Design a binder for this molecule. Structure first.
Ligand SMILES: *[C@@H]1O[C@H](CO[C@@H]2O[C@@H](C)[C@@H](O)[C@@H](O)[C@@H]2O)[C@@H](O[C@@H]2O[C@H](CO)[C@@H](O[C@@H]3O[C@H](CO)[C@@H](O)[C@H](O)[C@@H]3O)[C@H](O)[C@H]2NC(C)=O)[C@H](O)[C@H]1NC(C)=O
Ligand SMILES: N=C(CCCS[C@@H]1CC(=O)N(Cc2ccccc2)C1=O)N[C@@H]1O[C@H](CO[C@@H]2OC[C@@H](O)[C@H](O)[C@H]2O)[C@@H](O)[C@H](O)[C@H]1O
Ligand SMILES: *[C@@H]1O[C@H](CO)[C@@H](O[C@@H]2O[C@H](CO)[C@@H](O)[C@H](O)[C@H]2NC(C)=O)[C@H](O)[C@H]1NC(C)=O
Length: 475
């Protein structure tokens, strides 16, 4: 006898997650065109650990049949995966033509998943923007992205919507904006010149520009799905957001307010437009005219534009107030006057993982969910990512034994259970990740999978103890 799925609601969806650039490989194969991550990893090897790329990744593009067998072996209800925009539309625009070989790959994966009784949860956009669109008008820096995003979504609805019943417009627009345009840590790698880190950009203005267009693009796809496809395809559409849970470093009003500002700027930036059609008051106050306004039309489009909310949860941080100052480092990051740290009084917020900044704090998952329920009218929620990373610095034999990850999932699922007990309408949960994969700026130095991938020996797959723990949990 042990903790198992019967403790969760009937029909609850347990799954594992993936994304196209991180898993697929075949970056220049099967008619696929270039995307901004091809470009970023090739042109800035200094920004990826060991100068790695997703050229091959897990080679999920060729190995998907064997991988789907692993999903079935674990016994999962669902699988979260994304569509490579430049694989299906190599020139970004619909008028640039649809790549039949790219459509065929996703159809093949979906049909195999369904034969195993696994529901595909499809992320339309997981950061891999076609280089053609980045080149033409600067990608999400331009309002032109909205119409092209809408057409890409429509292509997905038309080709896959007869079988796909859960759509996620985009993964973590916070990450795309902050990482791509404030810190320059992610493609397209833009930031202010004073950071001496990116060729082009403005960390004080571009993140706000990009976030606005991310929201409008999302809203365009949702409007189209609901008005044209939802009634006869009978699916649901949402968006995946990420936030840290923010804890005041001390009991002071200063730190309490700082914690809420940090949450406002990371989470509220997206969930308040989605819920209320406006940005958080703190952002309006502190960012001023660098923060775009929603026109009345835009607000109507964005407000209420989700059937469900996808939430990605990894960590919590303590937050300190940062006093105003005279030194002029203009950025989205410094705009919130907040400072996050994993340590209080010299003590870490939880158990360590193989990722330096990341400690275990399962309580924060429930805290986030209750906060979301209470502030945003009790939405339907899927946990679309939750997981931990190991440092890739031991043998295959050792990496497969991951009691730390078994511990991680036991504690987080117990916390999730308590959130459901508190009335949060959670309907599903997805492990990041299915396989050890290309972890963006960290390359292959960090392993998040419940399944091990031996990159040094034919990309061979081996279920970890965590996979076997889930297998048992899922009966
Ligand atoms: C699937 O899981 C259920 C529930 O598991 C319980 O709740 C989870 C949230 C975790 O905290 C688990 O650690 C916890 O056990 C299992 O049913 C439960 O089995 C336990 C025994 O392991 C029962 O506790 C015992 O009950 C007897 C009386 O029958 C007492 O004499 C014992 O001292 C002890 O208290 C528990 O009552 C029971 N709960 C329910 C709701 O039935 C279930 O066995 C498991 N299934 C499989 C196949 O593993
Ligand atoms: N990685 C992110 C957010 C990137 C934000 S920009 C910058 C880079 C980064 O990882 N960190 C921290 C972070 C990590 C995860 C979530 C939020 C914030 C940043 O703030 N989100 C999810 O995390 C998953 C695990 O991300 C790893 O987290 C630890 C990092 O060291 C590693 O590079 C990253 O790939 C990704 O694989 C998913 O594709 C993605 O949806
Ligand atoms: C492999 O990487 C892990 C993770 O970085 C190392 O374990 C960490 O060691 C540091 C330094 O002593 C500690 O501060 C952390 O608490 C450890 N993290 C854990 C255990 O999750 C490990 O030492 C590395 N091993 C080798 C051989 O390099």
């Amino acid at each position: 006898s042990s903790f198992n799925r019967t403790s969760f609601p009937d029909g609850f969806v347990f799954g594992a997650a993936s994304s196209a650039y991180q898993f697929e490989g075949a970056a220049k194969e099967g008619g696929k065109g270039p995307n901004i991550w091809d470009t970023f990893t090739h042109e800035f090897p200094g920004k990826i650990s060991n100068g790695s790329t997703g050229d091959v990744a897990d080679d999920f593009y060729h190995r998907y049949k064997e991988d789907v067998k692993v999903l079935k072996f674990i016994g999962l209800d669902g699988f979260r995966m994304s569509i490579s925009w430049a694989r299906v539309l190599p020139r970004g625009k619909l008028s640039g033509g649809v790549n039949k070989e790219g459509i065929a790959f996703y159809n093949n994966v979906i049909n195999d998943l369904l034969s195993k009784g696994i529901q595909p949860f499809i992320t339309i956009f997981h950061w891999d923007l076609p280089q053609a669109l980045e080149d033409e008008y600067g990608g999400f820096l331009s309002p032109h992205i909205v119409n092209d995003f809408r057409d890409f979504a429509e292509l997905c609805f038309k080709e896959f919507g007869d079988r796909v019943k859960h759509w996620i417009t985009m993964n973590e627009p916070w990450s795309y904006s902050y990482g791509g345009y404030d810190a320059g840590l992610l493609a397209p790698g833009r930031c202010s010149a004073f950071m001496a880190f990116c060729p082009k950009g403005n960390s004080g203005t571009e993140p706000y520009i990009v976030t606005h267009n991310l929201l409008l693009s999302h809203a365009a796809a949702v409007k189209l799905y609901k008005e044209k496809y939802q009634a006869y395809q009978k699916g649901q559409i949402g968006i995946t957001l990420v936030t840290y849970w923010m804890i005041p470093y001390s009991n002071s009003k200063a730190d309490k307010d700082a914690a809420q500002r940090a949450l406002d700027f990371m989470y509220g930036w997206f969930i308040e437009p989605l819920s209320f059609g406006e940005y958080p008051k703190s952002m309006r106050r502190l960012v001023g005219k660098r923060l775009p306004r929603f026109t009345k039309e835009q607000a109507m489009l964005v407000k209420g534009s989700f059937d469900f909310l996808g939430l990605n949860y990894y960590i919590a941080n303590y937050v300190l107030n940062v006093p105003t100052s005279n030194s002029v480092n203009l950025s989205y990051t410094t705009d919130s006057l907040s400072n996050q740290t994993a340590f209080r009084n010299g003590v870490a917020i939880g158990r360590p993982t193989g990722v330096p900044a990341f400690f275990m704090y399962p309580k924060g998952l429930k805290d986030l969910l209750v906060y979301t329920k209470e502030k945003y009218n009790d939405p339907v929620i899927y946990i679309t990512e939750n997981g931990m990373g190991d440092n890739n610095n031991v043998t295959t034999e050792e990496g497969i034994k991951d009691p730390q990850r078994v511990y991680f999932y036991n504690q987080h699922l117990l916390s999730l259970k308590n959130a459901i007990a508190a009335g949060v309408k959670v309907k599903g949960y997805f492990t990041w990740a299915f396989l050890d994969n290309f972890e963006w700026l960290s390359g292959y130095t960090q392993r998040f999978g419940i399944v091990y991938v031996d990159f040094k020996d034919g990309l061979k797959r081996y279920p970890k103890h965590s996979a076997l723990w889930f297998k048992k949990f899922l009966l």
